[PDB]
Design a protein around this ligand. Structure first.
Ligand SMILES: [Zn+2]
Ligand SMILES: [Zn+2]
Ligand SMILES: [Zn+2]
Ligand SMILES: [Zn+2]
Ligand SMILES: [Zn+2]
Ligand SMILES: [Zn+2]
Ligand SMILES: [Zn+2]
Ligand SMILES: [Zn+2]
Length: 306
């Protein structure tokens, strides 16, 4: 790829976040024969069922609805070996600094708070690991546990929980255990402190000696050491800058570009990368990013960008 807009979680063989390929088919016959009236321009166009329409080219098909899906892009995949799109992950083409480390990194994760706060994937990982350690995940009745924007913005819980799969197997399994453990702790219990154990334990609440009976560890529930007698031994400017829609400096890529064929300056007016030259006698169709005739590789890698 010259450029990727999209990231998926590849469940096998990669077992990690990868660049993804976008596909559309006819929702009626399920073949790749749907010519869209208008190309996708944002996540809602490709995630909301039946949102986009066109015409199915299959002879005896009346289908007019699009169905979009994604595949891992790191190796060959079959026609419909699909993967879940991690729609919060964006390529950082405008060099936005990260809300917590202030470095320019790519890809980044964009929270769905009003501010659309930006955090790099390393800090997102660190943020999850910290919150797990400190027991700071947030409960949602219709979701389970998740995290809001790091800046604490309202209405910003991650809803698509495959985004936590990017923590990789061990942190992801700590995340998965969180709720069971939390139930124990709300009830006044205690987790075994032995690394690799962590059983949830519900001893009589006035007992200082807790025996894990898992691993047999007898501990002091106060200091968490082996049982003994006697006494135990976001920056404010960062969060203004690290916002997806905040005004930015000019990059090497211009926001007004010449048509590849007729050289007349063209303005882009939404998220679709498929441009149609507005000049009557030109009408070249081209990729805004790659500056070449519109094609299926551009479709797959970056039909739209955020
Ligand atoms: Zn893969
Ligand atoms: Zn069809
Ligand atoms: Zn960072
Ligand atoms: Zn926020
Ligand atoms: Zn234990
Ligand atoms: Zn103690
Ligand atoms: Zn032109
Ligand atoms: Zn392109």
């Amino acid at each position: 790829s010259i450029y990727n807009s999209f990231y998926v979680y590849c469940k096998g063989p990669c077992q990690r976040v990868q660049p993804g390929k976008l596909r559309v088919q006819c929702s009626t016959c399920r073949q790749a024969t749907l010519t869209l009236t208008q190309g996708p321009s944002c996540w809602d166009d490709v995630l909301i069922p039946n949102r986009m329409s066109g015409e199915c080219q299959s002879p005896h098909c009346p289908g007019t609805s699009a169905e979009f899906f994604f595949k891992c892009g790191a190796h060959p995949t079959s026609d419909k070996e699909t993967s879940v799109a991690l729609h919060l992950i964006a390529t950082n083409s405008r060099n936005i600094t990260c809300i917590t480390c202030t470095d320019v990194r790519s890809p980044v994760l964009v929270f769905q708070c009003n501010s659309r706060h930006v955090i790099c994937l390393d800090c997102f990982h660190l943020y999850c690991v910290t919150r797990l350690n400190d027991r700071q995940f947030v409960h949602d009745p219709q979701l389970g546990y998740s995290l809001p924007c790091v800046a604490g913005c309202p209405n910003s819980l991650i809803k698509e929980l495959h985004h936590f799969r990017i923590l990789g197997e061990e942190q992801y399994n700590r995340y998965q255990q969180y709720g069971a453990e939390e139930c124990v702790l709300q009830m006044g219990g205690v987790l075994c402190p032995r690394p690799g154990c962590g059983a949830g334990l519900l001893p009589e609440p006035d007992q200082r000696k807790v025996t894990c009976e898992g691993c047999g560890f007898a501990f002091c529930r106060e200091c968490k050491e082996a049982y003994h007698e006697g006494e135990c031994s976001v920056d404010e400017r960062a969060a203004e800058q690290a916002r997806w829609e905040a005004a930015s400096k000019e990059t090497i890529k211009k926001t007004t570009k010449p048509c590849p064929r007729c050289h007349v300056p063209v303005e882009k007016n939404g998220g679709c990368m498929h441009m149609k030259c507005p000049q009557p006698q030109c009408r070249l169709e081209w990729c805004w990013n790659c500056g070449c005739e519109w094609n299926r590789v551009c479709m797959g890698d970056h039909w739209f960008d955020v």
